[PDB]
Every structure is written in C-alpha cells, then in structure tokens.
C-alpha cells in the first residue's frame, strides 16, 4: 500500500502505492527450502583419484604362515590394498559423479520469494534479526538514487536516512574465522547490512558497491539468498520508484 518516499535530503516528497507483492503472509519453511536449494546448486564436485590405494599386485600368503590373511607385497610382508592397511584404499569415499543439485518447482519458489519480499515490511522481523535502524519501514527512495556515482554521496544519503549505523556495524563486525577455513580462502566472517534495489542498470550499482555489507542489485536479479541470508528473512532493504513499478506482477 502507501508508504512515504524520502529524497536524498531526507524529506518526504510523496506517497506511493505499493504493489500487491508486499501484501503476503510469512512462511519460513518455503524460504528455507528455496535458500537450501540454491546453496546446494552452487556446489562443486570433488573426490579422490580413480585408482587411489589400489595400484598394487599384492597376494595373500594363505594359511600355515602364522600371520593374518590380508594381501601382502610379493617381495615382502607389508600389507596393502585393503581399507584397514596403511596406504590402502578408502572404503566409501566421495565420488565426482554424485549429483547434489536440488529441485524446487517454479510456483513454490516464486511464492517463497514473494513471502520474503513481504517480510521486509515488518519492523519486528527486521529488528530481531540483527540490524539497527531508525527509519519507517519500508524505505522507498526517489528515482535519482540511481544517479549517484561516488561512494561519499551514498554515505551521505545513508546517514541522512538513518541506515549508516548498520553499515558501521558490518564494518566493525568483520572478524577472523576459526578452523581450517582460513587456509582455503575463507579468512573472515562477514555481516549483512543493507540491500539496495534498482529497476535498471545504472551507476548506482558501481557506487554503493565498496560499502561494507551493502549488496546492490536490480529487480531482475532477486533471489532468496539475497533476502534471507541463512534462511532468516527480515533483511534491511531500500527501494526506488522504478523498482516499485517493476513489481506489479513480478513474481505472481
């Protein structure tokens, strides 16, 4: 329905009627399913080598030799080729031909996306989910927001709209990860601040890009990860008039 529109100076300069996507009921399980399916589809095959631990010609000694019945080397008494022998193969390892992609029907995936979009209207879900804000949900901005081209201007707008403390929270929450993930490329653990939505590709997708936590996307690139990080809806977001225009029958 109606929501206040705020300019880059922070003053309400209109009252636009929201489309029917924003008016839907919250369904955690559908969002869960959609996010899990997409994260499963990102994955990448792995597994050991084809003949690992088995390139050998070991034979058993049989009985009467006073020892066990495992295969041994032909010119020694060292066991080989079996899963409980040192250097032997592994029983049931991962396989590169295993297919781990998940399926979700288009109707229920769109329904979960609508449910997640309508969740950003509720102040309670956003507030308890982690963020800090002092604005009137939902936040809607005039279409000149796509014209901003320097990060300083975006920071000025965020400060004037009461959404900069979340950006600072994400900046100072960046912290080193624990475990074997540091050595493989995942050195930090990040935080999610704010999502900016624009109708069409503009310089705003390049200006509000370096700001910590902020993810900027166009209306034709919304999925369930962006709106429910970790399968929890209630992500702070900003829209524009063009983005509101794009969502008359977007996911219905």
């Amino acid at each position: 329905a109606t929501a206040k529109t705020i300019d880059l100076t922070g003053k309400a300069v209109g009252e636009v009627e929201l489309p029917a996507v924003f008016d839907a009921d919250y369904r955690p399980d559908l969002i869960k399913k959609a996010v899990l399916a997409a994260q499963a589809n990102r994955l990448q095959p792995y597994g050991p080598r084809l003949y690992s631990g088995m390139e050998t010609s070991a034979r058993g000694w049989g009985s009467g030799r006073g020892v066990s019945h495992v295969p041994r080397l032909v010119n020694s008494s060292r066991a080989a080729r079996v899963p409980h022998a040192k250097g032997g193969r592994r029983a049931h390892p991962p396989k590169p031909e295993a297919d781990r992609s998940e399926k979700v029907n288009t109707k229920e995936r769109r329904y979960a996306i609508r449910s997640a979009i309508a969740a950003t209207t509720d102040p309670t879900l956003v507030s308890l989910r982690g963020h800090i804000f002092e604005a009137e949900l939902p936040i809607v901005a005039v279409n000149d927001l796509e014209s901003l081209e320097r990060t300083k201007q975006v920071i000025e707008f965020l400060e004037a709209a009461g959404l900069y403390e979340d950006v600072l929270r994400a900046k100072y929450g960046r912290h080193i990860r624990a475990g074997r993930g540091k050595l493989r490329g995942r050195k930090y653990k990040h935080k999610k601040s704010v999502l900016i939505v624009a109708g069409e590709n503009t310089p705003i997708l390049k200006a509000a890009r370096n700001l910590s936590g902020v993810d900027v996307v166009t209306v034709d690139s919304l999925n369930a990860e962006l709106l429910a990080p970790g399968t929890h809806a209630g992500r702070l977001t900003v829209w524009t008039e063009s983005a509101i225009g794009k969502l008359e029958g977007a996911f219905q």
Binding site: D25, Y26, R27, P28, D29
Partner: protein, 126 residues
C-alpha cells in the same frame, strides 16, 4: 492435549495451521462447543490425508444457504447452481471464481470462527 497431540503439532511447519489449532482449542473451551475441537483434531491428522472437495459434491449434497466447514481445499470441478457459504482452509482460483459467480462467499476458518461463536448450524464436509 497429552504428549501425543503435542507431537502431532510439532511435526507441522506452516505457522497458520499451528495458530489455527491452538486458537480452535481455546475457542472450543470458551464456548463449550465440540465443533472446534473436532476441526482441530481433523487438521492435526496426517497431511497426506486431508480433504479435497470438488464443487460437484457441494452442489449434490447441500441446499440453499448452508454453512460449511471443510478442513482441506475446495477444488473447482462441476457446476454450482445455488448460493452457498463455504468456509474452507483454502480455495483454488477456479473454485473462487465459480463460488463468486454463483453468489456465495469464500471466507477462511478465522472469519467463520470469529463471526459465529458456536457454529449453530455448521456442516462438516470431507
């Protein structure tokens, strides 16, 4: 509501069903009407065996201006002749259009439980 009904409640995932079950038991205690407790025990059954009722069955059995509780979904297959009130858990779009064209209403279980405190003349279908 022993541990048995608590387990059957814990299996569910959709929040609206859980809220319906709890509020139905509360309202049943409030009005001393076993209708709401019955509907709660029906909604708490396995999800595979819910009710799916076609328009033809309602047309076959009901009469002019009845009130109907369907703990399931009403499907559109058949022809509806006369006005009817069908408060069901969900409607398909064709069913909604047919009931609206006939001149009836399609109100959820919350609306029926709020409007009528006792169900003085409700007919359960399946």
């Amino acid at each position: 509501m022993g541990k048995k009904s608590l387990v059957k409640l814990t299996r569910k995932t959709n929040p609206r069903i859980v809220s319906l079950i709890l509020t139905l038991k509360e309202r049943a205690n409030g009005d001393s009407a076993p209708i709401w407790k019955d509907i709660a025990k029906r909604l708490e059954a396995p999800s595979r065996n819910y009710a799916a009722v076609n328009i033809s069955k309602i047309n076959r059995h009901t009469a002019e201006d009845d009130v109907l509780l369907i703990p399931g979904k009403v499907l559109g297959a058949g022809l509806l002749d006369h006005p009817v009130t069908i408060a069901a858990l969900t409607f398909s779009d064709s069913a909604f259009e047919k009931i609206t064209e006939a001149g009836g209403k399609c109100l959820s279980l919350e609306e029926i439980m709020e409007a009528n405190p006792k169900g003085s003349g409700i007919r359960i279908f399946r």
